[PDB]
Scaffold this active site. Structure first.
Site, PDB file in Angstrom:
ATOM      1  CD  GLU A  61       3.131  -0.097   3.864  1.00  0.00           C
ATOM      2  OE1 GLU A  61       3.253   1.001   3.282  1.00  0.00           O
ATOM      3  OE2 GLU A  61       3.440  -0.259   5.066  1.00  0.00           O
ATOM      4  CG  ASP A  89       2.758  -3.955   6.782  1.00  0.00           C
ATOM      5  OD1 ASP A  89       2.942  -2.775   6.462  1.00  0.00           O
ATOM      6  OD2 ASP A  89       3.560  -4.595   7.502  1.00  0.00           O
TER       7      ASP A  89
HETATM    8 MN   LIG Z   1       5.897  -3.822   7.566  1.00  0.00          MN
HETATM    9 MN   LIG Z   2       3.619  -0.808   7.700  1.00  0.00          MN
END
Ligand SMILES: [Mn+2]
Ligand SMILES: [Mn+2]
Length: 179
Positions: A61, A89
């Site tokens: 992320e 993420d």
């Molecule tokens: Mn997320």
């Molecule tokens: Mn994400």
């Protein structure tokens, strides 16, 4: 709310949040609740990465989409772990799994199921936080120690308080539904 956001989060998070909105054709000045939400999610992702031993997490992320997929692809080709259909993420080198992190103004379990049905992955771990101190994770495996999770919970609660104190919280909580 625009000025609240820019003074509540650090400039690096703010800058990543602006870039992310623009690429999806969103104006931060107008969609200010979306702006706050993206900043919160980013801050949680970075707190979470910091919660492990130094090398534990690969951070996905906050990166440019193309580079994000390249890193995901390197992890998959080198560990054998299944390729996710959507960008997660983080990747946890200790547990050998991708992690999707959620932050919701709604109930933890609701968001959790929505995220789980979207991804359709047995392998990917999901970990949801709320603004009310609750969390829910796949198989009740919370990844991090309790102190690391508690710090995140506290911060989200302070964000909610700072918002309510300016009359912005009602609008923010409702906006996730209206979407
Ligand atoms: Mn997320
Ligand atoms: Mn994400």
């Amino acid at each position: 709310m625009e000025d609240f956001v820019r003074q509540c989060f650090n400039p690096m998070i703010v800058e990543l949040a602006e870039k992310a909105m623009k690429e999806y054709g969103e104006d931060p000045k107008i969609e200010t609740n979306k702006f706050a939400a993206i900043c919160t999610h980013l801050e949680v992702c970075f707190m979470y990465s910091d919660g492990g031993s130094k090398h534990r997490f690969e951070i996905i992320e906050g990166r440019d989409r193309t580079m994000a997929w390249t890193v995901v692809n390197s992890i998959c080709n080198t560990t054998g772990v299944e390729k996710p259909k959507f960008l997660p993420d983080l990747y946890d080198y200790k547990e050998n799994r991708f992690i999707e992190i959620g932050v919701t103004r709604r109930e933890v379990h609701t968001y959790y199921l929505e995220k789980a049905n979207k991804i359709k992955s047995e392998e990917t771990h999901i970990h949801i936080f709320s603004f009310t101190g609750e969390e829910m994770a796949t198989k009740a495996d919370y990844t991090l120690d309790e102190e690391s999770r508690a710090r995140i919970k506290t911060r989200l609660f302070t964000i909610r308080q700072e918002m309510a104190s300016r009359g912005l919280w009602d609008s923010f909580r409702q906006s996730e539904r209206a979407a």
